[PDB]
Each structure stands twice: as structure tokens, then as C-alpha cells.
Amino acid sequence: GYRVFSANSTAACTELAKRITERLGAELGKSVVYQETNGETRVEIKESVRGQDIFIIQTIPRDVNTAVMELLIMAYALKTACARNIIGVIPYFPYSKQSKMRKRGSIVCKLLASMLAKAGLTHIITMDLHQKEIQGFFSFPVDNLRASPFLLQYIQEEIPNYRNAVIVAKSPDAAKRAQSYAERLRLGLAVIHPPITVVGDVGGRIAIIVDDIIDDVESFVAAAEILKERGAYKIYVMATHGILSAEAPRLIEESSVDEVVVTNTVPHEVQKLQCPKIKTVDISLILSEAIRRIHNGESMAYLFR
Hints:
InterPro entries: Pribosyltran_N (IPR029099), PRTase-like (IPR029057), Rib-P_diPkinase (IPR005946). This is Phosphoribosyl pyrophosphate synthase-associated protein 1. Seems to play a negative regulatory role in 5-phosphoribose 1-diphosphate synthesis. Binds to PRPS1 and PRPS2. Keywords: Acetylation, Nucleotide biosynthesis, Phosphoprotein. This protein has two domains: 1-146 and 282-302, Rossmann fold; 147-281, Rossmann fold (3-Layer(aba) Sandwich), CATH 3.40.50. The relative contact order is 0.12. Helix 6 (218-228) links the parallel strand 12 (213-214) and strand 13. The protein has helices at 15-23, 64-80, 108-118, 148-158, 175-185, 218-228, 248-254, 271-274, 284-296, 301-304, and strands spanning 3-6, 31-35, 41-45, 54-57, 86-90, 123-127, 142-145, 166-169, 188-192, 198-199, 205-210, 213-214, 232-242, 259-263, 278-281. Helix 1 crosses helix 9 (284-296). Strands 8, 9, 10, 11, 12, 13, 14 and 15 form an eight-stranded mixed β-sheet that branches. Strands 1-4-5-6-7 form a five-stranded parallel β-sheet, with helices on both faces. The radius of gyration is 20 Å and the shape is elongated. The longest helix has 17 residues, at 64-80. The chain is built from ten helices and 15 strands. The protein is of the alpha/beta class.
């Protein structure tokens, strides 16, 4: 009755996983995640799995390369322990921006989705995939859960006078993600796009930028200044995956973006200390649920439609 493990080794990078299990009444599976002196990762499952369905939880904190081996290795060790089904709960899926092919490089998101299966992953639960199409990369089932319900709720919770707001897209690529918020909130929609220009009336209104990820804040800022410069009195940046790498939290302070709202899909704590401009929304409930459903064999219609 509920086998859920963390492949995390940093004990705050295990916060979300801790949280999910609280909501399931469940207790994390006992299991050491070493690091050898030479750097090699090691995983030891401290309990029997013979024939049971197991849930791994992974968050990615910066050394992304180690988080993925920890994951792969743990899966592979549970496969060897004879796990019937190995379910990856990877709220933020790493390498997910590497989903197009740029130059002579590669779609390493696909590579990862292959390796994940080799390590013996029956299927993954995740949130707000960068592109819904990426769900194709996986040779096993996926649940690409949405954060909108919660992020949307937050709009109408403590965004003062949201109805005068206008949902904005940082770039054409983000036009779709933004469209869904405008449609659901019954609000206007603009898009930015460099020669940097906004397309849409924004003036006299609170701007709300929507996107899936906030990694490198640079273009989120340039967007906020130009929005301002077109009569945007308040700027809110909304996103699912708040990785905020490098000096992003500093740059947010220095910029005119008033608030940044992300989900606890990835760990923040340090970077939201840097910048209290960053408010964070809890998502462990949607995950708690999704995990509950596939275990008991229930339907996940509620989490989608």
C-alpha cells in the first residue's frame, strides 16, 4: 500500500517528495543515495520490492547530470529488486528544453527518455512538459499534468484586480501557453517579440506574463521593461518550473517585474531568499492525487479534463 521513494540526496531537494507522502499518509521508502569519493553515485534500496509497484520521486537541483543518474540508477536497482512497475514522478523533466534539434547537436530529451526506459521505468508522471509533443519521446505511458488550475487560482487569489490585467507571452513560442490563460480567465492577450516590441494593447493595465519555465531570466526582464514602457503598471511573471539558474534572482530585484510566481516543482529556497519578489505555489496535491490514482487503478480524468 504505497511504495514511493526519493532518488534525491540533498535533503531539501527531498522536500516535495516528503510533502506528497504526507498527503498520501505514506512513508518514504528506506534507501541510501551515496556519492563515492570518486564522484560515482550509489543507491541501496533498504527494503523488499519483490513484485510491487514503486514510485520514484526526483527533483533536479543544478547538478542536473547527477540527478539523472541517481534516477536511472535507482530505477535500475528497483528493476533488479523485481519491481513490477516503476513509476517516475519527475515534476520538472530535465533536458526538456533540448527537445528541438538546434545545430548539428541532438534532441537529448529523447535520448534521456530512452535511457530512462532501459533503466526500467514503466511510466512517468510529470508536470507541464515544455512541449506536449515531447510526450511522444517516451516508449511508455505518460501523464503530463497541468499546473494551470493552481496558478490560475492564484491569479484570482492575490493578484489585486486581475480582471483589468492582460495575459502576455514573452515570445511567439509562448503564445499558446498564454492563450490558455486568456481563454480561461476571459482576459485580453498580447505577445512580445531583438527589435523588441509588444503586439497588443497593454497600456493602462496590469501585465501578466505566462510561460512554462523560468531558467534564464534575461528575456523575462526585457519583456517587463518594454511592457512598462507601453503603460503596464503591474508586471506578474507566472510559470510552472522555477529553476531560476545563476544570477536570476538578483536580476529580478533590479528589474521592474513586481512579482514572480512559480510552483514547488523544482527547489528554490535559496534563490527566493535572494529575491522575496518570488512567491511560490504548492503543487504536491495534484501529484499526491495522480500517484494515488494509478496505484489504486483509478481514472485520471479529473487531473486533465
